[PDB]
Curated annotation (Swiss-Prot), chain C:
Cell inner membrane as UniProt keyword: no
Principal place of residence: cytoplasm
Top-level taxonomy: Eukaryota, Fungi, Dikarya, Ascomycota, Saccharomycotina
Name of the protein in its database record: DNA-directed RNA polymerases I, II, and III subunit RPABC2
Segment forming the signal sequence: none
UniProtKB/Swiss-Prot annotation, chain D:
Family statement drawn from the similarity comment of this UniProt entry: Belongs to the TFIIB family.
Recorded name of the encoding gene: BRF1
Function per UniProt: General activator of RNA polymerase III transcription. Interacts with TBP. Binds to Pol III subunit C34 and to the TAU135 component of TFIIIC.
Subunit relationships: TFIIIB comprises the TATA-binding protein (TBP), the B-related factor (BRF) and the B' component (TFC5).
Compartments, as annotated in UniProt: Nucleus
Protein name, UniProt field: Transcription factor IIIB 70 kDa subunit
Domain of life from the UniProt record: Eukaryota
Zn finger intervals (TFIIB-type): 1-33
Disulfide bond annotation, renumbered to this chain: none
Miscellaneous field: Present with 4330 molecules/cell in log phase SD medium.
Binding site for Zn(2+): C4, C7, C25, C28
UniProtKB/Swiss-Prot annotation, chain G:
Biased composition (Basic and acidic residues): 166-184
Subcellular location(s) of the protein: Nucleus
Family classification: Belongs to the eukaryotic RPB7/RPC8 RNA polymerase subunit family.
Post-translational modification Phosphoserine, affected residues: S162
GO terms of biological process kind: termination of RNA polymerase III transcription; transcription by RNA polymerase III; transcription initiation at RNA polymerase III promoter; tRNA transcription by RNA polymerase III
Gene Ontology cellular component list: nucleoplasm; nucleus; RNA polymerase III complex
Protein name as it appears in the record: DNA-directed RNA polymerase III subunit RPC8
UniProt region (Disordered), positions on chain: 166-194
Subunit structure: Component of the RNA polymerase III (Pol III) complex consisting of 17 subunits. RPC25/RPC8 and RPC17/RPC9 form a Pol III subcomplex.
One term of GO molecular function: DNA-directed RNA polymerase activity
Note: Present with 752 molecules/cell in log phase SD medium.
Keyword terms: DNA-directed RNA polymerase, Nucleus, Phosphoprotein, Transcription
Purpose: DNA-dependent RNA polymerase catalyzes the transcription of DNA into RNA using the four ribonucleoside triphosphates as substrates. Specific peripheric component of RNA polymerase III which synthesizes small RNAs, such as 5S rRNA and tRNA. The RPC25/RPC8-RPC17/RPC9 subcomplex may bind Pol III transcripts emerging from the adjacent exit pore during elongation.
Curated annotation (Swiss-Prot), chain I:
Organism of origin: Saccharomyces cerevisiae (strain ATCC 204508 / S288c)
Additional record remark: Present with 2520 molecules/cell in log phase SD medium.
Lineage: Eukaryota, Fungi, Dikarya, Ascomycota, Saccharomycotina
Keyword tRNA-binding: no
Superkingdom, taxonomy of origin: Eukaryota
The protein, known as: DNA-directed RNA polymerase III subunit RPC3
Family recorded in the similarity comment: Belongs to the eukaryotic RPC3/POLR3C RNA polymerase subunit family.
């Protein structure tokens, strides 16, 4: 899908990805980190092999959606209560000044 | 905890005094031991409400502070009918806003607080309004 | 980012087993954190078991937030969903 | 060493059973520390 | 430790943790490799968000932008032996709830 | 009434910005400046208090020793780094090929990146594309990294250039000298540099008539004092053309040369005491860092004292080799490999392939298995000799208060009991078998995480350690039986591929209430009747069951009413 | 306390409060989360007014408690530029005289702004004597209602607490245990967000408006 | 630390080192105060061959060059004449 | 440790700190990050600044760009690729940043030597007539003179404009100097290549020589167009016999002041050398000589066409030939007696000037001729650069390092063993000074293999010269010294802002009574002495950097 027939070997899997943790910890961990640090790649951690390291929920399996609770607001806690001094700001706060 | 607006609305007396009174209505008006010495009173209105960390300080340390600040040399109530006309009747002439904030907050006795609040009283503005716009003080 | 209303709903309304695997676990963890139950128990306590019992009675006060790769997030309730 | 919560300066005893061997105090029962770290 | 002699320890991974990835389990594979193993308290920051010791980051003298989040200790060991030679692995922090 | 409270916000880690140490923030996280004859790294019998190799203001890894700013111990002190002064700097052996690249793309006289101005803007255009990949950046940078080799002379200086190469052939880290062969691309022209090169070797009649006779060749070296001050006029108009962006302060190729050594903490490296013989361990990385302090101190003394330049080059090349076999080792060897920060990341025993991905988990147990048909296919029989040591936390939730009070008052000696308890107040772990048990089972506040024994009906994990396919981790339930060997069933023996020949097979338990239901609803045995490779049932029965049902239902097994009665009652 | 300033907040409700409605649980958390807390650039709170346009709140997988983000208006302490408010005296020193109040705040100590008079300290149990030769030579004793003229919001609040100075302070807590006269550490307290001046004190109940 | 000496002696009694540093301070006073009065209209309407900056410069004809002090004096006179509620 | 060691600014960006550290003190808060992003990346468009810095949208970036445009700290380029969208692409300009370096000692050096109009207390108008031109950028007389109500001084100001624009110093038409030097050569090469298709079959010689000679002559007339002009035209229409027209915008500070400043450096060189009556004669000779001299910046090689071919020797041939041809400068003592010094064998002035002018030769200063009529310099400015470098390295530590550097340069790159022949000490102090010199990157090392294997024990060592990398190292070292000095002075500004500002507000009429306490009087006087010390060291450090510039 990247255009040519890539392999699953250490040179093929070095392509096709951006997550330098799983690019490193496959077959050669010697200078994949050094190759990432010299060219200063800003890798956004999102997958699974780089989320088992930092310890966060991955986006595959169960963690494909963040569960949420409904807050059953019946459109009553949306209207505020005006204080009894705010019509005076239209009455006598712009009177010739 | 980020802040969106700084002065959305500035408040004043009695309406907010009744707001603090309605928040004081979570327990009683004054009774503290009559509800603690009897059997339940709906289990003490559902087992001793939210006062526990520091909440008894707030609104109780300011309901005394807003009530008695008359500042009279000697040796205390507001109502609906006394503020509903105070909002409208004093809106007469070209007058500022914090002037009326301190008028609604502090009641001038005869002339002292009225001289203190109104800056440039004799330099910017003329006479007789110190005298005519003061006799609404009898509305308590 | 866009709040897509109930008209579109570009997702099949069936129930993935991963969704119920999340919902039973989250409900059991809520009951273990002293949430009240909506089902009549029979003198037993296991939050997984009464989570299955509340699934049988369809009284889960949650809502599913199925994500899309464009940021649609497509609100699906628990009651209005085919098991 | 005398760091505890309910008592102060008591003796201690690492556990023999349950393959757990944490350094615990006496007469109330508080571990008063972390898990054991050995090399 | 290893074996049975010291106390003992039964590892899972490199072919075994991938099984629950093939199932699709998310919270079990998170818990049994983070919480049950080691719950650590690496402090972070936003501006040059390196590590500190509970009250600083020591690369910026602020002591205000410190988040006491959770992490396994093996990642902290990796970060210390990793930036111990010559690299600056920075950790940016995204909000989890708003937007 | 101050009591000011700053709000908190959960923050998830997104992104991973790799960079280099700028060697100016290395003095920010300093906490020590060692550099002061650290060969005396033990104060005459005990742990030191000076700078040294070990340090009190660096943490501890001992039991009763005190430590740095946080006055705790190894459990509380996170660790503190430390910088190290140097003179006559040293290349980085990990960034060595990248140093070859960044020095071969740059010339020698004006030290500018040698491209045409149109072609420079062209690759700045097709390198700053919004659609870019790891393949695209390497496929552009290694595409532009041949014209700098191919071009003969420079852009706007009076001299020419050549090839940058490792010295002759070295793989044993003896030929770690970068050469810039100015010749080999000239042919027969470009007089002035060639003229001064052939006129330099003519003037002396004393030693040059045998030097020119014998060596006749230099291929001038590019030692890091030449290199670091050639990476200083490295002007950032075209620095982005070779990977490094000059938008961060840690974005210059001066930092790729060792100007400072980060001393790691003493919490990461062990300070192991005597092991059955009265002798300290004196860990290998500590020995290498004190030996790299001592040679830098010898250079700092001898250079302003005044010694021979050949001995200086020998000792400084030993400085260059000791860093190169201190980090990214086993490239030189003048158990005798030492471990640095590459054997701890290499594989199958490092911090990637056996300490990070596959780590030794808690709450497990390993025992051989005996068969048992009389259990259902959802239950592994967990015997009480390993069930009383294998707990599960249960926060009391005003429903199981009577059951947890029963398991507290029962005691941890018998099986339906609880070992440890943790109330709402901040204690560590309150125990049951040592303190009170009657007074403790009276309050039972709601925030109480009590660990009771693995009772019946609890979801356990169970797996074989050689796991070839996905059907290895099947979430079973618990069952409490004597005779301490394990029992699962025999119908589900096919995915485990068990043989009952002394085959151990370990189990696990989940901990929180999320992962227990995540195990039993997603990995239950009732759900996993199918292998996913084609969708056939794999857990039906095994050899005795099929060959006995064949004898039951052959064609000629007419049963008596008593025999059919007993055989029909003896199934359910 | 005369404002209804609008601030946003992220609210964690405990899971045992699910039987109670949302408009009281958020009110409980914002009351016992913003009781007396001086926010930088904002000031001191007392209570919470109401709720506004609260949406559905997310749920973190690691904890299980409901995390609801809200926005609301609240009453904080922001006076005007020329507020004239009245408290009374409860403490006397030599340099200046701080005025007290019946419980909103304490540290509104006034500097040595001009004020036309001033002795060294209190000789005969009288804090400030106002001679003004030779008119209105009265004074004021304790518990005298003083109206003071406020300056701007001087809300400088710094957290310079490295742990080295923390263990210096834990060595200085044992200084407080037993000694005849230590007095090093309790006199040095962080002044909370207010260093407020004044220009008049009314000298009792016989002065109107003079000297600003 | 610092061993060497790159000989920058100060001869402050000389006339030229006083006057040249005074002109330095005067140049800093002119440049730190921003632009000058209405002579920058020529800088605005130079417009050699420039569509985009010939759109930019008539936008910043009314830029804050010398009208900030007059607006500040007018605001101070309005504040001395009457009260206004704004932040400082 | 504790940040007082000043390492967070020490071992970092040497070159990309001064050019936008100046505008921290000159421009302000947001007109500095534009240069900080433009120098750090190079080629930028309009939207790229907005997507890089998160300070503002594309509104206030315009204000910084149109504030830095006429100050020529930035140059633009409007071009398209193939289709359209004619947006302005941006390099970074250097000459305006040099003007912001040199401005005060431009205005305070020009008066005593170049402008000899008048001296009877005209310092009250020189600052007004020069600083307002630097700090604004242009000069239009109809809008600039309109602030002055008097008309009697207008003719004197016009005569000052005429005589000061005679000797350069103000680019007259002021066009085309916002274009890159490389872009001019590429555009002229592209235009002079597009004109000849469908001809005789091409070669490297015909195509390259024709295109490059046409590009050289057209780029030469382009660069020599703003140097000599006649815009001062229409003499005496009704009055004012010599008037400059006010329509054309008029910029400031052509690099003839830089030529004059290196001329003063060469006068200091000749003064410390033989004679010094040679100095008192050759100063007046060279200040009249250097008005028509070839320019230091040397176009036609700023663009990257310097390759090791016939173009490289053509540059040295041009520097030898044009310096003799285009000035001419038929200078003798009869020409020197026209501008003759007051009372400077005191009598019989002209024959003494003959003998002193004929005695100043061998070495390469004032290359003469039998019947001389000019003076070259092609092997005198590198001699000045080397001599300033050697006396700086004598200022570094002792005379021994200066002896060792000059003997390595003079005996033509010799090994180490014969150094003890031309020395004082045997082994200890020579290794000491060679160590303290090899800490600098000025005297290189050379390694040869003895058994074809790289080993640091069996090797003999010799020392390369490598002078040009040492000049570049000293140039960036002096640049970093100036940047660090001005950054510490900016910190000294910003840590004492409010007490300087309080005295700046309204205490000007009360400076005599001082309107303050005598403690902050001592504080203001001490920080004023600090600022005087910093500028007095900065002028010297700036001149020492200014020697190393070619
Ligand atoms: Mg077997
Ligand atoms: Zn105890
Ligand atoms: Zn930090
Ligand atoms: Zn510590
Ligand atoms: Zn070059």
């Amino acid at each position: 899908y990247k255009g040519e027939v890539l392999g699953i070997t250490r040179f093929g899997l070095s392509k096709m990805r951006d997550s330098v943790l799983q690019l490193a910890s496959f077959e050669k961990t010697t200078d994949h980190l050094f190759d990432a640090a010299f060219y200063m790649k800003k890798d956004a951690v999102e997958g699974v092999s780089e989320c088992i390291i930092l310890g966060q929920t991955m986006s595959i399996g169960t963690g494909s959606f963040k569960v949420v609770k409904g807050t059953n607001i019946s459109e009553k806690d949306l209207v505020p209560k005006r204080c009894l001094f705010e019509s005076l700001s239209n009455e006598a706060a712009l009177k010739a000044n | 905890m980020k802040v969106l607006e700084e002065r959305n609305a500035f408040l004043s007396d009695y309406e907010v005094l009744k707001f603090l009174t309605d928040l004081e209505k979570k327990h009683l008006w004054d009774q503290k031991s009559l509800a603690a010495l009897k059997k339940s009173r709906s289990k003490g209105k559902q087992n001793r409400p939210y006062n526990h960390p520091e909440l008894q300080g707030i609104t109780r340390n300011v309901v005394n502070y807003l009530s008695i600040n008359k500042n009279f040399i000697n040796q205390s109530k507001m109502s609906d009918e006394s503020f509903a006309e105070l909002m409208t009747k004093l809106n007469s002439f070209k007058l500022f806003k914090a002037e009326k904030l301190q008028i609604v907050n502090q009641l001038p006795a005869n002339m002292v607080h009225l001289y203190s609040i109104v800056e440039e009283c004799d330099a910017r503005f003329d006479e007789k309004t110190i005298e005519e716009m003061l006799e609404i003080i009898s509305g308590y | 980012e866009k709040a897509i209303p109930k008209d579109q709903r570009a997702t099949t309304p069936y129930m993935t087993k991963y969704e119920r695997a999340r919902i039973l676990g989250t409900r059991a963890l809520q009951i273990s954190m002293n949430a009240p139950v909506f089902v009549d128990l029979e003198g037993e306590t296991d939050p997984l078991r009464i989570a299955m019992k509340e699934l049988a009675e369809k009284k889960i006060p949650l809502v599913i937030r199925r994500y899309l790769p464009d940021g649609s997030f497509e609100d699906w309730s628990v009651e209005e969903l085919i098991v | 060493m005398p760091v505890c919560k309910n008592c102060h300066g008591t003796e201690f005893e690492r556990d023999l059973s349950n393959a757990n061997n944490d350094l615990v105090c006496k007469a109330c029962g508080v571990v008063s520390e972390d898990n054991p770290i050995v090399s | 430790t290893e074996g049975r002699s010291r106390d003992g320890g039964l590892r899972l991974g490199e072919m075994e943790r991938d099984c629950v990835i093939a199932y699709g389990a998310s919270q079990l594979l998170l818990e049994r490799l983070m919480i049950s193993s080691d719950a650590f308290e690496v402090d972070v920051c936003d501006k040059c968000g390196l590590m500190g010791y509970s009250g600083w980051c020591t690369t910026c003298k602020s002591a205000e932008n410190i988040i006491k989040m959770t992490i396994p200790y093996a990642a902290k060991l990796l970060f210390q032996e990793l930036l111990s030679m010559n690299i600056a692995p920075r950790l940016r922090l995204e909000d989890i709830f708003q937007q | 009434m101050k009591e000011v409270v700053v709000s908190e916000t959960p923050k998830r880690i997104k992104g991973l910005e790799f960079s280099a140490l700028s060697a100016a923030d290395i003095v920010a996280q300093s906490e020590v400046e060692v550099s002061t004859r650290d060969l005396f790294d033990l104060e005459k019998d005990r742990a030191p208090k000076a700078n040294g190799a070990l340090d009190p203001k660096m943490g501890v890894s001992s039991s009763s020793l005190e430590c740095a700013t946080c006055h705790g111990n190894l459990a509380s002190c996170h660790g503190h780094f430390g910088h190290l002064k140097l003179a006559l700097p040293v290349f980085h052996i990990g960034y060595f090929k990248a140093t070859i690249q960044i020095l071969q793309g740059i010339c020698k006289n004006c030290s500018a990146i040698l491209l045409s101005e149109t072609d420079k803007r062209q690759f700045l255009h097709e390198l700053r594309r919004p659609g870019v990949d790891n393949l695209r950046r390497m496929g552009i940078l290694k595409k532009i990294l041949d014209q700098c080799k191919k071009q003969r002379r420079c852009l706007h200086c009076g001299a020419l250039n050549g090839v940058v190469k490792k010295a002759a052939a070295g793989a044993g880290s003896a030929a770690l000298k970068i050469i810039h062969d100015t010749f080999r691309w000239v042919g027969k022209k470009s007089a002035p540099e060639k003229d001064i090169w052939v006129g330099e070797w003519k003037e002396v009649l004393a030693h040059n008539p045998e030097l020119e006779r014998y060596v006749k060749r230099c291929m001038d070296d590019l030692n890091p004092l030449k290199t670091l001050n050639l990476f200083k006029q490295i002007k950032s108009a075209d620095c982005e053309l070779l990977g490094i962006d000059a938008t961060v302060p840690s974005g210059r190729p001066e930092t790729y040369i060792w100007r400072y050594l980060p001393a790691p903490p003493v919490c990461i490296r062990p300070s192991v005491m005597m092991q059955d013989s009265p002798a300290s361990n004196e860990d290998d990385l500590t020995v290498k860092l004190t030996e790299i302090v001592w040679t830098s101190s010898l250079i700092k003394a001898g250079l302003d004292k005044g010694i021979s330049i050949n001995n200086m080059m020998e000792h400084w090349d030993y400085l260059q080799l000791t860093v190169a076999m201190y980090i990214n080792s086993d490239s030189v060897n003048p158990v005798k490999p030492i471990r640095g920060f590459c054997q701890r990341l290499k594989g199958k025993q490092g911090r990637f392939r056996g300490n990070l991905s596959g780590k030794r988990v808690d709450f497990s147990g390993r025992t051989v298995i005996s068969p048992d048909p009389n259990l259902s296919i959802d239950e592994v029989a967990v015997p009480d000799r390993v069930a009383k040591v294998l707990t599960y936390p249960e926060k009391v939730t005003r429903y199981n208060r009577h059951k947890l009070q029963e398991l507290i008052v029962n005691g941890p000696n018998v099986h339906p009991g609880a070992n440890y308890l943790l109330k709402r107040n901040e204690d560590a772990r309150r125990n049951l078998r040592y303190g009170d048990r009657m007074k403790l089972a009276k309050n039972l506040q709601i925030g109480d995480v009590v660990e009771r024994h693995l009772e019946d009906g609890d979801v356990v994990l169970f797996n074989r350690q050689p796991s070839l396919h996905r059907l290895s981790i099947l979430s079973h339930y618990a069952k409490i039986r004597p005779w301490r060997t394990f029992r699962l069933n025999e119908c589900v023996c096919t995915p485990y591929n068990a043989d009952f020949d002394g085959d151990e097979m370990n189990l696990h338990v989940p901990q929180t209430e999320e992962a227990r239901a995540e195990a039993i609803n997603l990995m239950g045995v009732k759900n996993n009747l199918l292998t996913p490779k084609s969708g056939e049932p794999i857990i039906a029965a095994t050899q005795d069951f099929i060959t006995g049902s064949y004898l039951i239902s052959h064609k000629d097994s007419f049963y008596d009413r008593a025999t059919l009665t007993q055989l029909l009652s003896m199934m359910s | 306390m005369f404002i209804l300033s609008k601030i946003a907040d992220l609210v964690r409700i405990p899971p045992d409060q699910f039987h109670r409605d949302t408009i009281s649980a958020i009110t409980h958390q914002l009351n016992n989360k913003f009781a007396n807390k001086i926010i930088p650039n904002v000031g001191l709170c007392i209570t919470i007014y109401d709720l506004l346009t609260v949406e559905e709140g997310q749920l973190k997988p690691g904890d299980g408690s409901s995390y609801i983000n809200v926005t609301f208006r609240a009453v904080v302490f922001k006076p005007f530029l020329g507020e004239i408010v009245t408290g009374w005296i409860s403490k006397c020193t030599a340099e200046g005289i701080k005025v007290s109040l019946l419980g909103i705040f304490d540290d509104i100590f006034i500097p040595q702004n001009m004020l036309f008079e001033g002795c060294y300290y209190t000789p005969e149990e009288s804090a400030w004597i106002w001679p003004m030769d030779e008119e209105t030579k009265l004074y004021f004793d304790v518990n005298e209602k003083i109206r003071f003229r406020i300056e701007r919001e001087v809300f400088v609040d710094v957290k310079p607490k490295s742990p080295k100075e923390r263990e210096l302070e834990e060595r200085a807590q044992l200084e407080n245990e037993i000694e005849g006269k230590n007095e090093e550490t309790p006199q040095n307290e962080k002044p909370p967000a207010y260093a407020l001046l004044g220009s008049c004190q009314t000298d009792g109940m016989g002065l109107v408006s003079w000297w600003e | 630390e610092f061993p060497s000496i790159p000989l920058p002696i100060n001869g402050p009694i000389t006339n030229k080192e006083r006057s040249l540093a005074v002109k330095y301070i005067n140049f800093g006073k002119t440049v730190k105060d921003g632009p000058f009065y209405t002579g920058s209209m020529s800088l605005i309407i130079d417009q050699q061959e420039n569509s985009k900056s010939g759109k930019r410069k008539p936008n910043i004809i009314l830029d804050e060059d010398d009208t900030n002090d007059g607006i500040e004096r007018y605001s101070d006179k309005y504040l001395k004449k009457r009260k206004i509620g704004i932040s400082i | 440790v504790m940040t007082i060691s000043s390492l967070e600014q020490r071992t970092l960006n040497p070159d990309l700190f001064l050019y936008k550290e100046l505008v921290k003190a000159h421009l302000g808060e947001r007109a500095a990050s534009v240069i900080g992003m433009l120098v750090a990346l190079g080629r930028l468009s309009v939207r790229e600044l907005v997507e890089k810095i998160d300070g503002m949208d594309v509104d206030s970036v315009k204000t910084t760009l149109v504030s830095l445009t006429q100050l020529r700290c930035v140059k633009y380029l409007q071009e398209t690729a193939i289709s359209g969208k004619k947006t302005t692409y941006y390099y970074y300009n250097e000459e305006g940043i040099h003007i912001l370096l040199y401005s005060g000692l431009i205005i305070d050096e020009i008066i005593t030597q170049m402008r000899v109009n008048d001296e009877e207390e005209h310092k009250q108008l020189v600052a007004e007539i020069v600083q307002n031109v630097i700090s604004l950028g242009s000069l239009t007389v109809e809008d600039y003179l309109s602030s002055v109500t008097s008309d009697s001084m207008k003719y004197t100001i016009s005569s000052l404009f005429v005589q000061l624009c005679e000797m350069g110093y103000l680019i007259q038409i002021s066009k085309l100097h916002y274009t890159p030097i490389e872009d001019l050569w590429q555009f002229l090469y592209e235009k002079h290549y597009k004109n000849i298709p469908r001809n005789s079959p091409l070669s490297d010689l015909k195509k390259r020589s024709q295109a490059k000679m046409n590009a050289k002559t057209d780029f030469a007339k382009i660069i020599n167009k703003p140097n000599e002009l006649s815009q001062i035209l229409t003499v005496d229409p009704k009055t004012s016999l010599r008037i400059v027209k006010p329509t054309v915008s008029l910029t400031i500070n052509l690099d003839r002041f830089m030529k004059g400043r290196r001329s003063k450096q060469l006068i200091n060189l000749a003064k410390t050398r033989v004679g010094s009556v040679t100095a008192q004669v050759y100063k007046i000779a060279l200040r009249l000589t250097e008005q028509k001299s070839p320019k230091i910046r040397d176009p036609l090689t700023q663009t990257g066409l310097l390759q090791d071919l016939e173009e490289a020797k053509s540059f040295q041939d041009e520097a030898e030939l044009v310096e003799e041809k285009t000035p001419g400068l038929t200078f003798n003592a009869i020409d020197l007696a026209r501008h003759l010094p007051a009372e400077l064998h005191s009598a019989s002035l002209i024959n003494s000037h003959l003998k002193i002018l004929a005695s100043s030769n061998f070495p390469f200063l004032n290359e003469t001729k039998p019947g001389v009529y000019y003076v070259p310099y092609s092997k005198l400015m590198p001699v000045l650069k080397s001599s300033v470098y050697e006396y700086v390295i004598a200022s570094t530590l002792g005379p021994s390092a200066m002896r060792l550097s000059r003997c390595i340069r003079d005996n033509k790159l010799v090994s180490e063993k014969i150094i003890n022949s031309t020395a004082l000490m045997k082994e200890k102090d020579i290794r000491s000074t060679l160590a303290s010199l090899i800490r600098y990157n000025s005297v290189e090392i050379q390694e040869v293999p003895r058994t074809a294997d790289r080993s640091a024990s069996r090797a003999v060592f010799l020392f390369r010269c490598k002078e040009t990398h040492s000049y570049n190292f000293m140039r960036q070292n002096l640049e970093w010294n100036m940047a660090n000095l001005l950054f510490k002075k900016e910190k000294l500004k910003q840590e004492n802002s409010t007490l300087l500002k309080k005295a700046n507000r309204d205490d000007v009429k009360g400076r005599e009574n001082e309107l303050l306490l005598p403690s902050e009087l001592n504080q203001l006087k001490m920080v004023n002495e600090r600022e005087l010390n910093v500028f007095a060291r900065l002028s010297r450090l700036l001149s020492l950097w200014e020697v190393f510039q070619m």
